[PDB]
Amino acid sequence: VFRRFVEVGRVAYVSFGPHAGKLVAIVDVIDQNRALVDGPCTQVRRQAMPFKCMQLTDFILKFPHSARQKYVRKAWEKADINAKWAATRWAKKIEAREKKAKMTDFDRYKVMKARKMRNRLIKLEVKKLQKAALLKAS
């Protein structure tokens, strides 16, 4: 059973291609592999764009089925995608990948350290929880 019903107005994140990593309102469906697509506030012209290069989100919005930019400018703008996206779990694990690649050798030295002691302060508690789990078993 699916939950994402490629409508007139599924917001879709463009997995890849010339406009990778941008949201896009599917204005209207052309064919069995191509949509008429537009990302007003994410900077993507009304153009054709295939279902293979796009993945799609729980979000919908409500322009009708060949509305003309100004009207998908709104419906995006209120409803407010670019803030609601960024409270999602997408946006925060994207913009994490981002931040690892975007990481100087310094940063990485810090983490090496910060991890180590985290992973000890976490470990000593796990050891102590098994002590309490063994004394509970007694």
């Binding site: 983490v111 985290r118 976490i122 796990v126 929880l129």
Partner: protein
């Protein structure tokens, strides 16, 4: 990557896998394909049986003990298909095959190692869902294995065992997560520096 490879044959495509194995065998990487019964083939069951039986009739008339060896175990069957994709007349090709190693079921050492999966040979990916097939296990049987029953009962015995480990490992993670929450203000300015350059979010 480096070190020894372990590939879990289930859900793969007999030759599609073997081409990928054989490339990396020739680049010096040690591969160990496991669980070859599970390995599966495009075309319907019989098709490939009929195609195997065609193999079995191919046989050196004037003496057969020289003639082609139609090994019956899936390990061996696959080996063959890998081998046909090596230049095995030559020294690097035989030196290659030695870097390969192939089992029916999943043995000592290799039960006890995490283990990988070639999506580009993986059946769910490479095939269409409305198409027919053989398991090299059942193929191997109807051609003259003796050991489909045994490698079943042993793998059921291994699965039951592995499940215990999976469940105990499951129980340690539940301790990790509860112990993060039971100590989250003397690691609350380390976890900070993790999530800032991406790690752990």
């Amino acid at each position: 990557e480096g070190q020894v490879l372990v590939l879990d044959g289930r859900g793969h495509l007999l030759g599609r896998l073997a081409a990928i194995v054989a490339k990396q065998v020739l680049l010096g990487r040690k591969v160990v394909v496991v669980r070859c019964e599970g390995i599966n083939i495009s075309g319907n069951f019989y098709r490939n049986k009929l195609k195997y039986l065609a193999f079995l009739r191919k046989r050196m008339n004037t003496n057969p003990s020289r003639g082609p060896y139609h090994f019956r175990a899936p390990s061996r069957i696959f080996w063959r298909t890998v081998r046909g994709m090596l230049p095995h007349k030559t020294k690097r090709g035989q030196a290659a095959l030695d870097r390969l190693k192939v089992f029916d079921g999943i043995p000592p050492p290799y039960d006890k190692k995490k283990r990988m999966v070639v999506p580009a040979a993986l059946k769910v990916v490479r095939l269409k869902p409305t198409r027919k097939f053989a398991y090299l296990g059942r193929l191997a049987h109807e051609v003259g294995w003796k050991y489909q029953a045994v490698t079943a009962t042993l793998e059921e015995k291994r699965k039951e065992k592995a499940k215990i480990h999976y469940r105990k490992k499951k129980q340690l993670m539940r301790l990790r997560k509860q112990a993060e929450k039971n100590v989250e203000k003397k690691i609350d300015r380390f976890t900070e520096v993790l999530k800032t350059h991406g790690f752990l979010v």
